[PDB]
Ligand binder design. Structure first.
Ligand SMILES: C[C@@H](C(=O)N(C)C)N(CC(F)(F)F)c1ccc(C#N)c(C(F)(F)F)c1
Ligand SMILES: C[C@@H](C(=O)N(C)C)N(CC(F)(F)F)c1ccc(C#N)c(C(F)(F)F)c1
Lengths: 250, 250
């Protein structure tokens, strides 16, 4: 009815609750980091499955699909963390998973605490802007499509048409509430700017990840296989700036 | 004729360093890279010893000395490779060590021809500019002091004074041969522009290094102790541009 079919479809393909499988009996640095990595493994599997039902995605060359997933993995994860924190704990806690909800107390380490403060920016903006699920779902797809190789994608044409249709869908999502043209136009600017700023934010997560990855044995932190492959295959390249981040505003 | 500081810099240069490569067997990706890392471990140890005799260095906070060595090791190594190739084999071969010399055919047959060509650029530049030993010595010190943390060093004032001292010394080295205010002025520009450019070239070596490090077990490429220490300590941060490369030109 009032809800555009594409948005309803996106709602229906959202993943079910994902647990970190964290141990609540026995916590610590490596323990917390290991659980977060376990959660990361389950999240990656979720994004891949999700991408198989995302209208238009399966039509892109297979290599582009793999590349886009790996490129956006961290971004989609932190964005999802932002949504969950916003929806379950009014953004006042980091809701990584039902069995892994972190607050100030569980962030003893200055390095980890700083990282969390950075992630906290998303939930906070979600609360400030009062993002709707309709808007979040469309923004999530745009995130998936927010970075491309320097030489571009193999299915570049199809990629741009897809990005455009989801940009039009984000506008429709905004139209659901923001009825005014001036207000709806200003809201489009705010949401797309939030997406632009994610590049800077995620860079910090990428670096923290790679550093912990390299010192995994010494830090006693386990990194599951699927995620390990994403980190080994693209993070060094991404941190070195060997990719093309897409921006809505120059 | 030769200024005292330059004479001292020449007296503290390390002796010849061997890679310990077994040239009795045909090259393999794993054996060449492993010997390069072994040579690397030895070069690193040589740099530490040298820094201990380098005027001004020992007076910087101990943490700063460590940071500077970890930030510049790759730069110092490739620069050294450039000098050695230029002096021993007219710059027409990569003279890593007396027991590890690669002419172009050996480069083409390695699994990293492209990397070899990148490294080979330095020696060729030395041939083109006819860099003197006096200029080379001062330039090498500046490379050690060519990158600082975003927040700066603990002994920042002292660092700034030491760096300025060696820049003044480079100027003296140039004056040892360059005559005419203009040509000597242009020479300072060229050599400092060369140093600025090294940042770009070193970035390619840093990525190749990190990728190989991450995949060390699969590729059978061993990374010695101190070598692994500096890589895990700063490589990801450096690649992500979370440090301040110093530039002579805007
Ligand atoms: C990849 C993993 C890691 O490398 N660790 C060292 C724990 N880590 C990234 C880091 F940068 F935060 F550390 C994350 C793991 C799971 C989730 C979720 N959900 C998230 C986030 F996106 F929500 F922040 C991040
Ligand atoms: C660090 C090491 C490495 O990580 N390997 C995978 C071998 N490697 C860097 C690479 F990028 F070339 F691979 C080097 C090792 C020794 C030397 C010398 N001398 C040099 C250089 F100075 F010539 F560039 C580079």
């Amino acid at each position: 009815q009032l809800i555009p079919p594409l948005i309803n479809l996106l709602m229906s393909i959202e993943p079910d609750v994902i647990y970190a499988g964290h141990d609540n009996t026995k916590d610590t640095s490596s323990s917390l980091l290991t659980s977060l990595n376990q959660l990361g493994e389950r999240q990656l599997l979720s994004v891949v499955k999700w991408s198989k039902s995302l209208p238009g995605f399966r039509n892109l060359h297979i290599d582009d699909q793999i590349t886009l997933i790996q490129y956006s993995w961290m971004s989609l994860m932190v964005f999802g963390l932002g949504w969950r924190s916003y929806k379950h704990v009014s953004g006042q806690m980091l809701y990584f998973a039902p069995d892994l909800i972190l607050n100030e107390q569980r962030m003893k380490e200055s390095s980890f605490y700083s990282l969390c403060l950075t992630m906290w920016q998303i939930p906070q903006e979600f609360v400030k802007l009062q993002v709707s699920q309709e808007e979040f779902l469309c923004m999530k797809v745009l995130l998936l499509l927010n970075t491309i190789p320097l030489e571009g994608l193999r299915s570049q044409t199809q990629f741009e048409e897809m990005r455009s249709s989801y940009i039009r869908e984000l506008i429709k999502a905004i139209g659901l509430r923001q009825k005014g043209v001036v207000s709806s136009s200003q809201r489009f600017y705010q949401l797309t700017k939030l997406l632009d700023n994610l590049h800077d934010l995620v860079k910090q997560l990428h670096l923290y990840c790679l550093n912990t990855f390299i010192q995994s044995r010494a830090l006693s932190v386990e990194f599951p296989e699927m995620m390990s492959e994403v980190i080994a295959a693209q993070l060094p390249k991404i941190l070195a700036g060997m990719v093309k981040p897409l921006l809505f505003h120059k």
